[PDB]
Amino acid sequence: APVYLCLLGNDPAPAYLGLKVVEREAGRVAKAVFYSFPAWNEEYGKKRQAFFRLLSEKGVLYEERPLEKGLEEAEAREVWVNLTGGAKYWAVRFLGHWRRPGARVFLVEGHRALEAPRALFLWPREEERSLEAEALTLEEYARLYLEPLGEAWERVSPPGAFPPGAQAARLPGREGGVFVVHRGLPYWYWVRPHLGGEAKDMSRKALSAFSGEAKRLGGQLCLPVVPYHKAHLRSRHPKERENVFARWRAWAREYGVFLVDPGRPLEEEVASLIKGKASKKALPLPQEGPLLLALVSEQAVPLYAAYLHAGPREVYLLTTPEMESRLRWAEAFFRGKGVRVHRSFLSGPWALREVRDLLAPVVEEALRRGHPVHANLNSGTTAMALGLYLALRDGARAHYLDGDRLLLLDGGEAEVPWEEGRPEDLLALRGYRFEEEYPDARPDPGLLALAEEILRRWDEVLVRRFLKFWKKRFGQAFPPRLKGLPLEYAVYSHLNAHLAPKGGQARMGGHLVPLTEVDGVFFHRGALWFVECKPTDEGLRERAPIMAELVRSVGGVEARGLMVARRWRGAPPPASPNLVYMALEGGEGVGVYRFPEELEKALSRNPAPRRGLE
RNA sequence: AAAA
């Protein structure tokens, strides 16, 4: 009987799907071996145990092994190797090793909305097939995702907006959504069934929370589908209607929600997102090195790291039509840095062979002409990244950012010149213009004393003497809203003293304008941080839910939020995996760190960015 | 991490 060899990351669903594929084609497996990465949080840990429970019910013996142990000869005559799981770095390394007799190597690719996942066989023959039959059912998702999270559920009729064949469940403990499984993929679909729910305005708070909720319930590719409240729009003045709708659209883009017309089938809404983009031409051959080749996808930091490392004169960017906005912002970023940009669209996220065929000639020409060729392997789907790897030839320089350092695919690590990074550049790459409120503010000992003076005497009606020294030292005047400025300047000053020595960059507050307000921002070693400054723990508690989603969506997976109070009083801060809570005074012995004395301690309790592959 |  065949043996299943499988990279295992946070989500058990692609691992399970790959097992169903093997079982359908080859029958009962002798055993499964999982090369597992540590689960990123307790919920994923629980989902993984649910997966192992399912394997046990399936009569499938399994074991977990370190990744390196997967780079050895097979014991069984026939192995099926699934490379979808975990970091694409390991897919690349396993693909090198497992292209051998006695092995079938494949991926499962489910990143196009409303399609069934595909199997891409890479070895011994390139083949692709639709996984309509093997697609996970609602019940399979319930036992892998919902049961381990303690979510009760019951089957309900699916929303009419889905194509035929969808299955759905209501979660009585989770108001406001329906969990829909369609052709093997999960969707968290917004419903407001209570009378006049659809006639109310939609909030930034509810939209952001819905996106986080979708990701907790259904994982990384669970699409939050939100039919907008057209009845509310019809209740508006025509001008206000345009304003309201624009706000919803902006919020939905910001938190990763798929905002849809309730009057249309989802198939049409998805088609509109991908329509009219087909690229016709090959990529122009390179004229000037160095070159950077990269995919474009949700995380901007790896692409930015690649830019800092490679210092390219030409960049080649490939992605899918559904990532058109991100591609547009990446192109603008690189053009703004004087880099020649070439871009093309793939037919879809499965298009490994398109990436390979688009890039092979560019690589070959570059190597002929002696242009250094850098290839970043962080972005796109595993299919896309493997496509890029397969375009490479001896001499190419492939890397993968692992938190704060680049892993070199042929061995060794590159330290990134992070000291050359700027938070405003990262944000541009991501799709935002950071409009600073205090661009010329810099650290100044005397102005800091004043600010700190004010902070001791916060019982308020000196503030005029602060604003006057601000005018003097920075040339900035204000017309007769600045109450938060003393805390913001103090926080910025101590951040800057802590970070500058170490190559980090700190900034004061302003507006994140899509191409939301913050009290500060800093970038250090592959993690962006947004800062929120409040008089009390009370302002921070109220801000935390939205801040956590802003940090995640706009800052990225390794981003964090620094929450600083002048005075901490109440209970310990609420559980926040991506926020850090500090205070000038108070909160000793309730988890809250002391600012600025315990900065080092606070920023390294859970180091950002995380290294996954040490 | 199923598009670090």
Numbering used by the authors: 3 to 463, 472 to 490, 495 to 529, 540 to 638
Give the text the authors published on this PDB structure.
Type III (Csm/Cmr) CRISPR systems utilise a cyclase domain in the Cas10 subunit to generate cyclic oligoadenylate (cOA) by polymerising ATP1–3. TTHB155, hereafter Can1 (CRISPR ancillary nuclease 1), was identified as a potential accessory protein of the type III CRISPR system by Shah et al. in 2018 (cluster 107). Here, we show that Can1 is a metal dependent DNA nuclease, activated by cA4 binding. Once activated by cA4 generated in response to detection of foreign RNA, Can1 cleaves supercoiled DNA to generate nicked products.
